[PDB]
């Protein structure tokens, strides 16, 4: 399982979604692949709401409702920093999937999480928010439920 | 002043290495600088981490942008005939900050006869 998520988070563009309930160690999951990566050869980013704790080496922004930044204009923002990898906090609504399916065929490498019970319940959410069924099966990696 | 020396040497540097890029990024314990050289990302420089504020400060002000606000992204735009275009972003230790520099036969290149 770990040769698998590493060949897959060291592509070099595509999503990869970590999905299951709350308090299943997601963001532990991902804070471990974002330090895997955490080389001197790449530029990483993330999104969070908020920031679990600092990987020193990997920017990360907090979203902050005081000045209206939010997942969406955060991710839009971090795209404009010309990163090799990028991570959302979660794609919880259809115009930061948008963002995050564009990141992906831009040559990015995206990382996210969703809230579903199984791990064809994340390409599931991923057709119900909005996203053309076809733009799936070209970003999207895989799945880690 | 010194910073303002500091970082047209920089971006001499950056013009004289070929790179396209500029990566200044503030974490907590350290301040790094790194030059994109034609898509791979290079360790230069790491100065003392007090910096951080003075080199986004002085970026800013040559961008034209705004100095006190530090909790949304401003894009701006310097001519040096190197045209370069920062974008600065708000992060967990201060902002972070890149600049892209953009200058203003095909088999020789890499094609194949056919």
Do not use: C
Not at chain 1, 12 to 24: D, E
Request: hydrophobic share 40%; glycine share 8%.
């Amino acid at each position: 399982n770990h040769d698998n998520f590493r060949r897959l988070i060291k592509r070099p563009h595509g999503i990869i979604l970590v999905t299951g309930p709350t308090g299943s160690g997601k963001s532990t999951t991902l804070y471990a692949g974002l330090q895997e990566l955490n080389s001197s050869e790449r530029n990483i980013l993330t999104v969070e709401d908020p920031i679990e704790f600092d990987i020193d080496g990997i920017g990360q922004t907090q979203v902050n409702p005081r000045v209206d930044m939010t997942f969406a204009r955060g991710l839009r923002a971090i795209l404009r920093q010309d990163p090799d990898v990028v991570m959302v906090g979660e794609i919880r609504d259809l115009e930061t999937a948008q963002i995050a399916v564009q990141a992906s065929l831009t040559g990015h490498l995206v990382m996210s999480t969703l809230h579903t019970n199984t791990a064809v319940g994340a390409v599931t959410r991923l057709r119900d928010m909005g996203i053309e069924p076809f733009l799936i099966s070209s970003s999207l990696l895989g799945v880690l439920a | 002043a010194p910073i303002i020396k500091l970082i047209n040497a920089m971006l001499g540097e950056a013009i004289k290495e070929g790179a396209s890029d500029i990566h200044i990024e503030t974490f907590e314990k350290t301040l790094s600088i790194r030059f994109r050289v034609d898509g791979v990302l290079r360790e230069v420089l790491a100065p003392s981490r007090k910096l951080s504020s003075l080199l986004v400060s002085r970026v800013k002000v040559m961008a034209k942008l705004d100095i006190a606000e530090k909790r949304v992204p401003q894009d701006g735009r310097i001519s040096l005939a190197v045209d370069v275009r920062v974008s600065t972003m708000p992060s967990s230790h201060g902002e972070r900050v890149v600049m892209r520099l953009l200058d203003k036969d095909l088999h020789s290149l890499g094609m194949t006869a056919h």
